[PDB]
Amino acid sequence: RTYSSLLEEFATELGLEEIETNELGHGAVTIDKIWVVHLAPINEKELVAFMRAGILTGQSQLYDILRKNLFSPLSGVIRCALDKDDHWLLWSQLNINDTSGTQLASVLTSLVDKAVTLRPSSS
């Protein structure tokens, strides 16, 4: 698989004609007019999918997120950082060759769901 063929797969899975990318392969999908999930290669073998969500609500969330920030054997796990303004930055890091259009679409929907809470298709 290549990065660009993976994006083609992902567009097809979502029912878009194309996920355009800039010079460095940075692409984006806008969700319900307001949220944006960004896609980019980060090294030779891996890409990320990520979004800025809302401001942290309180100390309670930081514990909740950290209690869940544990290693996993799964792929497409959603992780959470804070930006300099205490907004959540939600992200997943994936192997280009190991992932599919379907898993990327699951990542996208999981990213969006977290934000709110805070080859043929395999769907």
Partner: peptide, 28 residues
């Protein structure tokens, strides 16, 4: 633009969001 699992989705983003992404990606 289409509908996917209850979400309205389109390729693209407002420029400020692309700027934000460029910032995050340039600091890793």
């Amino acid at each position: 633009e289409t509908t996917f699992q209850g979400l309205t989705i389109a390729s693209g983003a407002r420029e400020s969001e692309k700027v934000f992404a460029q910032t995050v990606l340039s600091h890793v």
